[PDB]
């Protein structure tokens, strides 16, 4: 019948029972304004509806209603690469919609086919820092930990724009065959953030090879909540039916958990831990099903989110469940931000975990594990280094410090810094590692193997 | 040890010798008072409680 | 050393047997004085039933036993569960219960009393009655087994002060 | 038979629901998903739907299954992956092209496809029989003890039919019981609900251990069937690693794996692994997965599913515990399972207590850990089993003083120390001697004694000479190494053989990392017999250096010690051990004079 | 009636009016199988109720309801001790039964005498510094604070087994002229732990000595909360009727507090601080109260409460709680009982407030309680200099902070080890407690009055 009432974003509907869960019902208002909703319960003469389309401006008594009668499934086809859409899978772009090859449930998936056999073979992202000390296997959930004295994005836009580059560098060593594709998420963007990485994309060609889905920091949040689990099903359809390798890169996710705190006490729940849901985990854990080698076993899903936290706070609940689903994480310095190193992240707290089983062959070395243990000792006794020579002088200061101090700087501005169209493989990553080692005697070199080092000094 | 082989003799006869006597008096004192405390009980079940 | 725990290890099995001669001691004694209580117990359900079969010695037992739970029952209709040879007996004294209650409350006189056509088994009950709701929810047992068994709790001290002090 | 009220997330509400139990299997819509009632008020009863509750409007059936829901414990469960609430993936994989279950997919506990060969017990028709005594068997196994098939817990009477040899499906029913007119029929398998602990003739206290074949957990404080123990996680950079080892070198009759609530790469690797790796007693037919029955669960699987988990897999010890069995339990990690109830809370509206997690928590865990402990298994002619419980606990707020690790370790008597920087460096196990204990010591090292060997001699010693290790290297940072005595430098020289041998051992070579209980008793006994030979000798008259050449050969055999094999001879007395202790005796008066 | 319905512990009872509080119902299942449960709240037509024994399988009208008529009373008998029974108000064991010749309730005020005359009498452990340091009479309340790294079980029985060898030695020098009996209550430990304390108990001594609860961790929180109520009935009745000392031996007190705590998270009780209930001060209560001399003045009922903690602080509600209705306080130490001290209890904040309650002087020295207090006090100091020996070294420290690092060291190896079954006397204890004092000289103990000092050195 009419709406009952409203308090919120929440919607009371009178009405008996005729729709299903999570059926799409249209509300019409006359003064030339529709709007769409979706029952986010159904109650015994009564429903509640949150909806897509606004938030006030909503009748009590001239609103009449229709039943859509299709519970909410996303029109997933793969002539969307190449192309802007928003939060609700409208396009942006402006022109004809493309529509769907299938309507697939987003709600769990309708069939879920995710591994059990583990994640073998290399993925590269294009940074040299990233893949020797922090490498990703096809459907290993490794994320990026960031933090506000950072532009989390465009550290966000590098990783994106130079995967899938990386993919023609390997067929050439002949380790890859297959069409690889990309899935953007970005929500809560700005509008001057997001033009940026539109922009960036088109400049590398890597566009044509993108959907991206943008919802603003201005849209509902249950729209919000909705656009990763939109893009978890594009990057399934493409993984599954047509066996291709599509790497999904999910910003920001704590736009996501604010979002789900803002529908935590819309709800008749009562939350956890400093007002955050305690089923926080229930609803990351949808995001995570959908994530992993799809069975035919030549088609993933990889999942890359970003999380930021306020100024690396732990006591936060976010990072620490989360932290607890995925295998590792990437850790960014400020310090090294302030210095001006770019991009400034920090691979000592950072960890992938089984990084000797994360990499393949024919598109890595077996030498990838011998050169990560190597790089990292080097740049902690660094750390040391520096702190040292403070305190001691230089008129005084010890013969290995000397090497570990000029090593401190060379691997931040070689490996770690590097241009915003560079990109790698870990047959590149690999050279650099050898001329920073070089100046190191093979005395000192002695967690790599005899035969290695006499070859790769 | 000894008094450990011959003591699974006496962990009857001990227990046995030691309540011979009551175990006669126990069910002697029954009979007696047994007619006297069914009375009783007859009595408090006719009797509503 | 290890003639030390050689040595306390015979004295350990020496009061192990001292403790088990002990407890069969008061496991016999137990026992014993329950076997009497079960058999005092046992006299006096076999003394009820035959109060209970003949009939005319059990009406105003009966009457009693029914006017007794309908106090603790407050509804105006009670169906009483009998055994086929008490639905008789009740039937023949329906209105001195309900004249009997009213004068025993104050909420007001009994309605009726429904003699249903289930009853109370006669190999699993000696005798008595099941005095119930009137949508059959809460029940007062004041049948013979049930009545001894509760009295049981309070007699059990009486029982014992009378014949071991 | 009930009507939807309500569906508020993956909460239904439903009226009309009478004589509806409060642990009732009920499926919810057309669709028929898994739910249980948690709580009823009035009429409605309120149901955790554990499938996705889209399409379900409200006016949909709610049919009883007319019973708690249940678990089925007989044949045909070694050598299959499972759900927390046991649902065979494997089965899915051959209808549906899915790894995992998705919503409005359910099917059986067991497979019916499959027959298994009953064979008749020692009763006969007309004979009485009683609450878990040996009805028959079935043989499938030829590695291991089978499924001894049991007459169903609190359940007695006459056998009216008992179906002679051949082969049944588990199914089909292979036994009437007179009991009462006819009592039912009861099948190959029985229901039990996994939230009742399973019966046995008693439980005792523990005391019995077995071949663990990881030489650290006998040798720095002994590994026990029938135990209860904390180990620290990892989140697969090191959990994992312990997990695989502890269930390929342990030669327990069963092992149960339970993935309360993991990653998916730790669940994805222990399903390829077992059946590749080699049985380290003989024999194959997927050799250590013969002997193996999993539940794994990633994180992503319902919610009720990763909080059953543990319950599921506890009554499946229990079972093979009245065959008479030793079972590992081995579980990763009571932490996720703990985030559930969390979750679970959270959805009912229930308060919970400290750090967001309930207060039905610390009862659950002592209620879980006594279910698992040794017994003198139930039927007739009585055998001895045991379920010992290996329980990781990780961080859930990134250190161990949160609820979950503070409460087990409590109820716990044993904690090993995994140590971080050599688990990085890929040894394993590596457990530190500083943080560990076992309350089991005493009890146990009378057992060993009893047994053949040295074992409360060597143990003790082994401690205490890591200890001191400790404190005596401190007097050489800040003294010197050299204005101390010869005495001293022995003490750390010893330590060191004990640390590199036993606790750097690598779960990469089988050479490294397989060795009987024995074989490790004997090479702890080659360390202590040179400790005090070198502090006599040097008092004596000798010094560090003129030791240290003079001991030779048999330092170099003491160091070479793990990498020898499991037998010589025997793999219970080696005889390279035997002999070796002659050599020291010889070399002795030698060095000394 | 039938039940309505069943939230967690609490069960909805549609019902009739005429129930009191705390008056017994029993549940008959479909199974024909009865289960016992009190009404915690009633009101009109309807009850909850708390029902000890399970928690699930409660139905709707396939069910019934029976009233007992009879609130819970406990079948107390002074026939006891020997006798097995379970914590239940029966055995479920299959032991000897309870029998009755009183039952006495556990609300906290049946007919309760208790102490208008505080204790005066000595009652010794065997160990020196329980009995020594703090002191234990015939009415102390001394609380076991334990850790989830020291074994809880084995200092329990250990003080238990002790106290029973000395306490006849005590019966003939006239500190007693009345029975001992021991209450030992378990409530909701491990199977392995209930197995072992029978044991202990058994190789001492016999088992015919104490009474036995046995209370299953599978079993719920309700029967828990019971248990020790129980106890207290056994207790309360040895010491009224027949004049006898009663000592109680409550493990684990921990596992009873929990126990409230999720009787008001499935409730809609609002818990106070950190979690644990605001009228969990009452619960205590309970337990602590009933306890000192028993009217006639021969009878008592004294209380060793065994209490885990399970973070190990000294900032968890429960010790802090404990400890301010407790007579006295007795802290372990994990520390200690890593060197290799058995007995490895710690005292510098073992303290008794009501000190001279606890000691004795006609069965023991007058000179006991002037010698335990230099001796915590010098302790302290031993205890400030260690903490000053590993930072400032001993290039600093004075000649009066040697003689109390020598203490310390000699205090813990000699009078803190003791055998397993070595028992000491109170006497034998000041002779060795003299040996500790005789190293400082006439100077450094100047505090005490100088009458002792040169009476006894």
């Known amino acids: 019948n009419t709406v009952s009432g409203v308090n919120g974003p929440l919607v009371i509907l009178e009405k008996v029972k005729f729709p299903r869960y999570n059926e799409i019902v249209n509300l019409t208002l006359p003064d030339g304004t529709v709007r769409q909703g979706q029952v986010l319960e159904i109650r015994g003469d009564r429903a509640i509806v949150q909806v897509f389309e606004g938030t006030s401006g909503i009748d009590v008594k001239k609103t009449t209603v229709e039943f859509t009668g299709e519970s909410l499934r996303i029109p997933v086809s793969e002539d969307m690469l190449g192309r802007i859409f928003d939060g609700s899978g409208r396009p942006i772009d402006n022109g004809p919609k493309v529509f769907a090859e299938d309507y697939l449930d987003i709600n769990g998936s309708p069939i879920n086919p995710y591994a059990r056999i583990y994640p073998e073979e290399m993925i590269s992202t294009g940074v040299s820092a990233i893949d020797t000390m922090n490498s990703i296997a096809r459907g290993q959930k490794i994320p990026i930990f960031s933090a506000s004295g950072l532009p989390h994005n465009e550290i966000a836009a590098q990783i994106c724009r130079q995967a899938g580059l990386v993919r023609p560098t390997k067929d050439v060593h002949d380790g890859h065959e297959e069409n690889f594709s990309i899935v953007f998420a970005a929500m809560g963007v700005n509008l001057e953030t997001a033009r940026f990485f539109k922009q960036d994309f088109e400049e590398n060609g890597s566009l044509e090879r993108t959907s991206l889905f943008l919802n603003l920091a201005n849209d509902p949040t249950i729209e919000r909540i909705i656009t990763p689990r939109l893009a978890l099903t594009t990057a399934e359809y493409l993984a599954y039916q047509t066996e291709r390798h599509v790497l999904t890169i999910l910003t920001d996710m704590s736009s996501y958990a604010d979002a789900l705190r803002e529908v935590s006490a819309a709800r008749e729940e009562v939350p956890g831990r400093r007002g955050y849901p305690g089923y926080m985990y229930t609803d990351l854990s949808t995001i995570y099903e959908r994530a992993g080698r799809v069975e035919g076993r030549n088609g993933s899903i990889t999942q890359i989110p970003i999380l930021t936290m306020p100024n690396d706070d732990i006591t936060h609940p976010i990072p620490d469940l989360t932290g607890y689903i995925t295998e590792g994480q990437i850790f960014v310095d400020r310090q090294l931000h302030n210095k001006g190193i770019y991009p400034p992240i920090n691979v000592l707290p950072s960890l992938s975990r089984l990084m000797k089983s994360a990499i393949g062959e024919g598109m890595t070395r077996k030498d990838h594990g011998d050169v990560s243990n190597q790089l990292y000792a080097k740049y902690a006794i660094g750390k040391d280094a520096a702190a040292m020579k403070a305190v001691v002088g230089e008129e005084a200061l010890s013969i290995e410090d000397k090497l570990s101090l000029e090593f401190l700087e060379k691997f931040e501005k070689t490996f770690i810094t590097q241009g915003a169209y560079e990109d790698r493989t870990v047959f590149e990553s690999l050279d650099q590692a050898w001329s920073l080692l070089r100046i190191y005697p093979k005395e000192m070199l002695n967690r790599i193997s005899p035969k290695i080092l006499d070859e790769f000094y | 040890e000894q008094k450990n082989a011959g003591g699974v003799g006496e962990l009857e006869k001990k227990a046995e010798a030691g309540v011979q006597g009551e175990l006669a008096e126990i069910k002697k004192i029954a009979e007696k008072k047994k007619d006297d405390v069914v009375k009783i009980l007859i009595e408090t079940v006719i009797k509503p409680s | 050393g290890n003639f030390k725990s050689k040595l306390k290890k015979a004295m350990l099995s020496q009061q192990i047997t001292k403790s088990t001669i002990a407890n069969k001691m008061r496991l016999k004694v137990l026992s014993a004085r329950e076997q009497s209580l079960d058999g005092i117990f046992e006299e006096t359900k076999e003394k009820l039933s035959g109060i209970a079969n003949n009939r005319d010695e059990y009406k105003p037992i009966l009457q009693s036993l029914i006017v007794e739970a309908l106090l603790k029952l407050l509804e105006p209709k009670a169906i009483v569960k009998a055994l086929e040879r008490d639905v008789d007996l009740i039937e023949s004294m329906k209105d001195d219960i309900m004249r009997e209650y009213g004068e025993k409350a104050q909420r007001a006189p009994l309605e009726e009393i429904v003699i249903s056509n289930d009853y109370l088994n006669k190999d699993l009950v000696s005798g008595g009655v099941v005095v119930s709701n009137a949508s059959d929810k809460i029940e007062i047992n004041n049948t013979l087994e049930e009545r001894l068994k509760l009295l049981s709790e309070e007699a059990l001290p009486a029982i014992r002060l009378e014949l071991y002090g | ?593």
Chains 1, 5 share one sequence.
């Open chain 4, 1 to 593: 038979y009930g009507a939807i009220y309500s569906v508020s997330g993956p909460v239904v509400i439903a009226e009309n629901m009478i004589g509806c139990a409060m642990y009732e299997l009920v499926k919810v819509g057309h669709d028929n998903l898994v739910g249980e009632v948690i709580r009823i008020d009035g009429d409605k009863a309120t149901i955790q739907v554990y499938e996705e509750t889209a399409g379900l409007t409200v006016g949909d059936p709610v049919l009883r299954t007319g019973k708690p829901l249940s678990v089925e414990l007989g044949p045909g469960l070694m050598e299959t992956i499972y759900d927390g609430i046991q649902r065979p993936l494997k089965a899915i994989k051959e209808e549906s092209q899915s790894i995992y279950i998705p919503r409005g997919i359910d099917t059986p506990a067991l497979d019916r496809t499959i027959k298994w060969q009953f064979t008749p017990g020692k009763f006969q028709v007309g004979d009485h029989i009683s609450g878990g005594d040996i009805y028959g068997s079935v043989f499938e196994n030829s590695l291991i003890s089978s499924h001894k098939i049991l007459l169903p817990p609190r359940s007695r009477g006459t056998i009216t039919w008992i179906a002679p040899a051949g082969e049944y499906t588990l199914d089909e029913k292979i036994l009437e019981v007179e009991f009462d007119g006819k009592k039912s029929d009861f099948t190959l398998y029985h229901t039990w609900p996994v939230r009742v602990p399973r019966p046995v003739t008693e439980k005792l206290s523990a005391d019995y251990p077995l071949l663990t074949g990881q030489r650290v957990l006998d040798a720095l404080f002994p590994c026990v069937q029938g135990g209860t123990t904390c180990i620290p996680g990892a989140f697969g950079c090191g959990k994992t690693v312990i997990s695989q080892s502890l269930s390929k070198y342990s030669n327990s009759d069963a092992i149960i794996y339970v993935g309360c609530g993991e990653r998916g790469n730790e669940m994805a690797e222990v399903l390829m692994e077992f059946p590749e790796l080699y049985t380290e007693m003989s024999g194959t037919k997927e050799p250590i997965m013969k002997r193996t029955t999993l539940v794994a669960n990633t994180s992503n699987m319902p919610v009720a599913a990763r909080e059953a988990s543990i319950y599921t897999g506890i009554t499946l010890a229990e079972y093979f515990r009245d065959q008479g069995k030793n079972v590992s339990m081995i579980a990763d990690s009571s932490s996720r399972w703990a985030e559930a109830l969390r979750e679970i809370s959270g959805r009912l509206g229930e308060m919970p207590a400290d750090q967001g997690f309930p207060a039905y928590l610390g009862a659950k865990l002592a209620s879980f850990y006594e279910r698992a402990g040794k017994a003198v298994a139930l039927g007739s002619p009585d055998r001895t089993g045991s379920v010992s419980i290996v329980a990781a606990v990780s961080p859930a707020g990134g250190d161990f003083s949160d609820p979950v690790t503070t409460a087990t370790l409590g109820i716990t008597q044993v904690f090993w120390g995994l140590d971080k920087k050599l688990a990085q460096r890929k040894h394993f196990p590596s457990i530190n001697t500083s943080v560990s204990y076992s309350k089991y010591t005493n009890v146990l090292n009378k057992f060993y004694d009893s047994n053949y060997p040295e074992f409360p001699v060597l143990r003790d010693r082994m401690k205490e000479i890591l200890s001191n290790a400790e404190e005596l290297e401190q007097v050489v940072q800040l003294v010197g190494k050299s204005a101390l005595s010869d005495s001293d430098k022995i003490t750390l020289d010893v330590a060191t053989l004990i640390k590199e041998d036993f606790l750097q051992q690598n779960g990469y070579s089988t050479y490294d990392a397989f060795c009987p209980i024995w074989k490790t008793f004997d090479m702890m006994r080659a360390f202590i017999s040179y400790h005090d030979e070198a502090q006599k000798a040097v008092a004596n008259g000798a010094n560090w250096s003129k030791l240290a050449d003079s001991t030779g050969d048999v330092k170099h055999a003491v160091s070479s010690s793990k990498f020898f094999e499991p037998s010589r001879g025997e793999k219970e007395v080696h005889g390279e051990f035997e002999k070796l202790l002659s050599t020291m005796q010889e070399r002795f008066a030698e060095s000394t004079d």
